[PDB]
Amino acid sequence: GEKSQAYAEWKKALFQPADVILDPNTANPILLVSDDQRSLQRADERQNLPDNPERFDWHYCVLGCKSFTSGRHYWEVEVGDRKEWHIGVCQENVERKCWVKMTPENGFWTVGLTDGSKYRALSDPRTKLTVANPPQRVGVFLDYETGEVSFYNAMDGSHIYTFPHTFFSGPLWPVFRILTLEPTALTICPA
Amino acid sequence: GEKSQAYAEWKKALFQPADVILDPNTANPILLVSDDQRSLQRADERQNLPDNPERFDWHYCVLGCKSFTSGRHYWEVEVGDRKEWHIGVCQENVERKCWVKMTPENGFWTVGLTDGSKYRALSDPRTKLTVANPPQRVGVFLDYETGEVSFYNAMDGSHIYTFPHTFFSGPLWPVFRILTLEPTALTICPA
Ligand SMILES: C=C(C)CCOP(=O)(O)OP(=O)(O)O
């Protein structure tokens, strides 16, 4: 209880709770956004969607509906028993159509999981993470002004990863990515 | 380059720069504190020194000359190629005379290196770290109010470790521990 309590108090001293919903107009055509816009699944094949400019056509990504240009913000994501996921932030100006490698140099700050047990930060090169207990819920923490993106196990307060401090260019968006077709959705925790 | 600049801007924006000097009165008798109080080495054998109450008698530890009871503070330590070292903060009330495990529950928040290649956080139990580039200079970051102790590579800005947010009791001192005889001293970088 003490580690959860200190995690709650820290998030109150410093970070504004963001109420993040998924924008279906940004979602790759293989993704399904839930009607309440909190949950994400994958289809067996691309669905028939317009190719509007905001849509990720290659990467299996979706954005939030609000961006950040300043300030300290957090949100929490129920990854549950998923075997695969990536979450974090990206710049408004990322390449959405052509492939680009999802790295900080290309405007992406994400961590995640592959093959049930391989936790990685998508630094370049990728950082192999050591996680003592697989997180069911992950907190994403942004400080725009200091260039900080960090990740915690939201249930026990343990730290997962902090990217090197950087300089952002333009607005940042919450980003979510799933590659697999598996029973458990990715779900955003309401603020 | 940019990662060093962003690390510099972050530490300047949010943390008070501590000018840390070693207190030889606190040092375990096997330690040698330099005349300028910036450098720490180990002697071959325990020196004959008085067992005054403030002196560490069991652990091979020394404190700084100033504690923190509030605020955000940072300092940097040149570890160079030294194969063994642990650094961080501890509570004024730690057990200095008798055997105790150096853990957060016992008032110590430290990380470091064993046998040239084994990075650990001194959590209970110890957390094995994976560090892609061995740091030569380590930044120690304290936020008293949010219970935060984190550690960075002070040359490239890469993150090393963040303890779970906690609650501190009383003053925190910079603490330094070396177990081995090695050519390379630990040296505190001035503010
Ligand atoms: C033996 C002493 C007094 C120094 C190291 O203590 P431990 O052997 O308990 O090891 P750490 O895990 O604290 O390095």
Architecture blueprint of SSEs:
Two copies of one chain form a homodimer.
Chain A: H1 2-14, E1 16-17, E2 31-33, E3 39-42, E4 61-63, E5 72-78, E6 85-91, E7 108-114, E8 118-121, E9 127-128, E10 137-143, E11 148-153, E12 159-162, E13 172-177, E14 186-188
3-methylbut-3-enyl trihydrogen diphosphate is lined by residues 59, 101-102, 122, 126, 179 of chain B.
PDB class: signaling protein
Keywords: Butyrophilin, Signaling Protein
Assembly: dimeric
Question: What's the gist of this structure?
Answer:
Chain A is mainly beta. Chain A contains one helix and 14 strands, in the order αββββββββββββββ.
Strand content of chain A: 25-35%
How would you sum up the major sheet of chain A?
8 strands, mixed
Morphology call of chain A: globular
Number of helices of chain A: 1
The largest contact between protein chains, plus residue counts on each side, is:
A-B, 30 and 30 residues
Compounds present?
3-methylbut-3-enyl trihydrogen diphosphate
Q: Give the SSE order of chain A as H and E letters.
A: HEEEEEEEEEEEEEE
CATH first level of chain A: Mainly Beta
CATH superfamily of chain A: SPRY domain
CATH topology of chain A: Jelly Rolls
Number of self-contained structural domains of chain A: 1
Query: Which percent range fits the helix content of chain A?
Result: under 10%
**Which structural class should the secondary elements of chain A be placed in?**
mainly beta
The first-to-last residue Cα distance of chain A is 21 Å
**So what's the oligomer here?**
homodimer
Number of strands of chain A: 14
